[model samples]
Target: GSHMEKLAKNKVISIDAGRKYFTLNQLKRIVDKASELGYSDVHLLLGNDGLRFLLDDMTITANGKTYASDDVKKAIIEGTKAYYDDPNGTALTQAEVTELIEYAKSKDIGLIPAINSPGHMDAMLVAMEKLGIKNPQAHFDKVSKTTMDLKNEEAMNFVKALIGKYMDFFAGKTKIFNFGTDEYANDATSAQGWYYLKWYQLYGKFAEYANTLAAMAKERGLQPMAFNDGFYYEDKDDVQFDKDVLISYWSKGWWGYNLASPQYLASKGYKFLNTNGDWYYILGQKPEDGGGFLKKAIENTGKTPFNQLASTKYPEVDLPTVGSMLSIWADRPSAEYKEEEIFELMTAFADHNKDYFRANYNALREELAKIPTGYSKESLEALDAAKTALNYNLNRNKQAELDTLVANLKAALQGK
Candidate 1:
């Protein structure tokens, strides 16, 4: 089944709360607090490897008999119980599925369900097997943890079935689906366990997988997103991408040095989201670590530190950025810790930006007032040339010009 384009919403503002497996009530409380802080659009990152953590601890058994995998039952029981505790999602009923949506909407938030696709396929497997997809080739065993044969017919069928079921079930609500394409060893690694010499070609395979789901989403009338690992291709002219493919410019680690990539994407008429780690990674820290020192550090560094890098936002580049996200990559998060970590990060990051924008806006306007009247006296022909030069396009050696501009701007803004 395919999706319609008219039903898809183009604008996006997303939040990636570390682990969102809290009970229905707990989730409600978390969202309520997040709304109060002016935070919106939480990422329900599904099919995470961390879900296995909960499953391993919450295993269940029947009277005088145990199920095929005790680990999975534990995951279900604990997970369901936690969900039941929430106002929207009860363990006993699937009603929370819808309730969660209503809650997000009520808070004027967009709920982007980021179920890491193709790679993060365990949840679909769990669902299909439960629905009597017995002898399922792709139905991964929580016990074995063996890599399933993804190219198998049953695997593809299982994914299609799960998407059809959930897309229809949560239709009109689930808008953006983030197909996580990060640290993909399978797609990145060759048989020798080394990255392909033609890394761009290797990465395109992952992009192709993302496109498959994007096509599915198109059929269902939804926009699909994928994480960018800063490995975009330039050497191979033959490579292609679906026009609708939304790239999330994640600014993690050494990759944070460049902001031009998103701007480059925007220059090509592609829409962008500008969430950089130096400006927006809350999940990388813990609750006991206390946010005061780190918060001030972020305000102090001005440049993105290793800690502040993950999903980066590039709004400063004047890119057509949707917005930024604050990611929480919790490994085995408890319900209690989830809220604590989220609030700490959201308040610190959001408040700082709100203040920065207010100050920067006023300062920029003041600076604009000082421009000489003669600066605007150029005739139409001169203006066009200036505009073309300002855009810094066309010239093959334009990077030097851009570098000069960056260095001068940094020096000018250092006092600020």
Candidate 2:
């Protein structure tokens, strides 16, 4: 009932586990920490430069031809192996994903499943090749290793069909499906291809691609989201995008990078999630050891306000984003995971933004530890209710309620 809850959207921590294989335990660790940090969501990058996640029915049909489940699985694994074969697993099983879903539900944390496409789809591209679709790579001056060839009819259909499989699988499981339409074919040219599509007359089709995916998600009762690079590039909106799609505004478009601004997107009636790329951490690059973006992310964690969009603080424009996200990318996929550094960044981000982030359950759990376990049935029932009540992610305004629950439990244990 206070004004604090109205302004707070809570934090979201994104992990690029798509590029590198993150085990079930590793993924669970992220969800567990997300719960303790009072984070609302954990955005899992299941498809980036690589796709290491597969569904039970991996079968896909394209151009009047159907692919078997086993065949699709083999091709995708081959593609992932071609990209960067991790010593620690390559793909995550459907069972593991199901387990994660249950675990997240238990903690009342929403899991945002990301399956990037039309860009950062190295495995899908290779899988298309292995499935006997010829010339799947989109070419500007050079072939894009990760982006799909949107011009090829079969290629386009295949990608849609493939992404459809994932969408269908995730329909009832998640409320949000991130299509991750970010950095479209940037590697083929020196800069991003959002500009080239317009000049090349493919911008219309690009809009169709986005609308199609957004429609696919919506039809399944799921909301669609994407990165903000391709939406209304150069401040022109000739090509329309679905208004329902949430824009994850990560970049403000640098000198050569000419993506739309957050202010411009908001002006166009699109809501955003402040996925500030400045808070990005790439694996294995420690700050003390020839630090890169990870080092800068540490420095700017507190410097940047919790609610500010990326590069929007110059004139102090406060954008109304649904949530703030700390992103970890896998630019170098082979490098070993630095678990300590990962949590250190997470801890710092949440710690520094305590006003917006609520983590009262940690203290309560610590308090719970003081009471003896061998208490009477009434005391134990009180303890269970106390545990169950805090799962609401209660704020400090509700501190009195939690304190009373603890008091009752403790008194019951002492036969008072």
Candidate 3:
């Protein structure tokens, strides 16, 4: 029991690979490196491209061809036309997923699978017509599919079927599931004009869908998790989730809805894990306002405002928390690195040893600089400027300077 419970407390590190397929071996490389680097938990997001892996005996049609669930899985694994037709392209078959889970288990690294819904269901919603599942808002395009209408009964049923099937496959072994309920059709461009205008009206409807899935997870003796946006957008009193559901509190910008306030959620008695967009996103084009980018993340030593503001805002109860998670939202390997290099960066994030990520940053810099053509003079200068601004002894006014420096580095790298 001691050994088993130990697995339950492992820290989570997430890989958002919904757009690119990685073979089982690639998955193993990342998982193995994570374990060796002191991480004990891994969350892998497969999105719609990964749908066929869990669809079981179901069948659907598109582009004048019929596909059984297994055939769909094969298409994804082989990177067939059906898989490529959708932007969310990636493949890890049922067998490969099974094998990967077992491999993580053997290393004491718990692997949790993520299935996004109510949004990012391009592949799933597109096939609704053939599957005989009705989605009122299932608009099709040469490239994209519409979001599910939260109020549609058939939509809820489709979600229920997905929850049951995914839970049966992963619940017993993994103990947690991530039902991605973020970024629904909130824009007029993506959804109907009326839908966007009255988006908040269906907040309750979204909650019901989440609670329904949470209930299923509980029955199977597993915990459920979701992006915090749904609850964040709802009036606090109207929001409902199974108390046990884990909330990942992420808000990149301080303005614009600014709905995901971890402290507020904590005050309401919901425990959360941090993947605040400012700090967690590792791969992608760099942002304009630097805030907590790679440099800030590496130098952070104490509980940062990102981590401390919650407890400060809600002092009582010690605010139950699952440890912070670092996220890598990569569609493809970053232009600056190979997949292994990215994994190395992730390992550094996972190493919660002394000095936060500072030492790892130093080691990584050394490695890159040693690369014959890796670190250009312009790049190093930009990095140095960032470091100067982050230095504990620097004047706080350098915060703006740091952002400028990071912007320069981003420009130089892109030009390279």
Candidate 4:
């Protein structure tokens, strides 16, 4: 009974798609799986490189690279590409998106449409450059892109229009929106110059953009959601977000470290979602570790006491956390795990939320061992050798041995 209570109370365990696009069929499968696994919402991230033109009028491009609407057609007609290097794949259309929303609603799940803003915005920046908008800047990471050019009124207008189109397309199917404002500092700069005072001025600029977009979303009856990267720049007092905008607090570093504590953010009158990266990312590389972190987040949330706030911002507040979500960056979707892996991760998420997730990780270790792999004597010997080599000295040779073993195991699991 308590297990059911826990599951019922924690209603926001969500899935976020980064750049990987899925066809309507695949998306339907995802929603069905999420429903079966007890997930509450699925937020599809439509960045510049994402399904930009799903609504027919949306477009973003740069330097000879454009999101081909034809690719979108192929993805829908055929299916989404399995790997990144594959063709452009499918993008959704207005009608297709509407159909998807209806499907999600029928399954009693909320579908929140997402897009990156002020940063991670290379797609729109390139399009702006093509549109003759001045001073737009772009950054190249191995694959991901970032953008920021606040002074360009025309560029701002483009984003504003995009927001309107997204809301209008969803059209009361869901009221929540995700504006990805994570990782802005990698290429933080303005036409002025790059500046960093502990955090960075780029964060301040991004905060302004988030505020602008959040306000716009509210005006249209949608509540905006954003990452907590901007809250760290709070000391600057230069970048403040709308109090109503929900914050998703994620940390790849120490938990207690941020521009403000979770308590402080709550005190400042903002509701947040704990996507704290320390506990919730699942990938093939670390298949055995998901349960450990999920347990930690649950334990930490439970132990945290609601403290009185010393504030002038609003009435007294407590830590207003909605719930937590397990995130998969899914950068290498091709190399990513398939059905069994998805099942394992979702099972771990579901079990942990119900207070049955084991803290020692043995529970997951045993459960994952049943994933139907060869696990031949050769594989066992390789794993043992790799472990011994690492204990002796964590040098490149040992690391290479470990890497080889991992590749071997992955191959076996896939029947390659």
The model with the greatest lDDT is 2
Instruction: Write the residue-wise lDDT of candidate 3 on 325-404 in tens digits.
Output: 66666533322324654565565554433212111122223333443346678766755554444432112223344345
Candidate 1 or 4, higher TM-score? Answer: 4
Model 4 lDDT-worst window of ten? 305-314
What's the lDDT for candidate 4?
0.52
Question: Which of 1 and 2 is the better model by lDDT?
Answer: 2
Ranking of predictions according to TM-score: 2, 3, 4, 1
Error of 4 at 100 (Å): 2.1
CA lDDT of each prediction against the hidden true structure? 0.44, 0.81, 0.56, 0.52
In TM-score terms, candidate 4 sits at 0.64
Candidate 3, residue 184: Cα displacement in angstroms equals 1.6
Higher TM-score: candidate 1 or 2? 2
Clashes of 4: 4
The lowest-lDDT stretch of 10 consecutive residues in candidate 1 is 1-10
- Which residue segments of model 4 deviate by more than 4 Å? 1-10, 13-16, 48-53, 59-90, 138-144, 185-205, 232-238, 252-258, 282-318, 355-416
Q: In model 4, state the lDDT of residue 91.
A: 51
- Between 1 and 3, whose lDDT is larger? 3
- TM-score of every prediction relative to native: 0.57, 0.90, 0.67, 0.64
Clashes of each: 29, 0, 0, 4
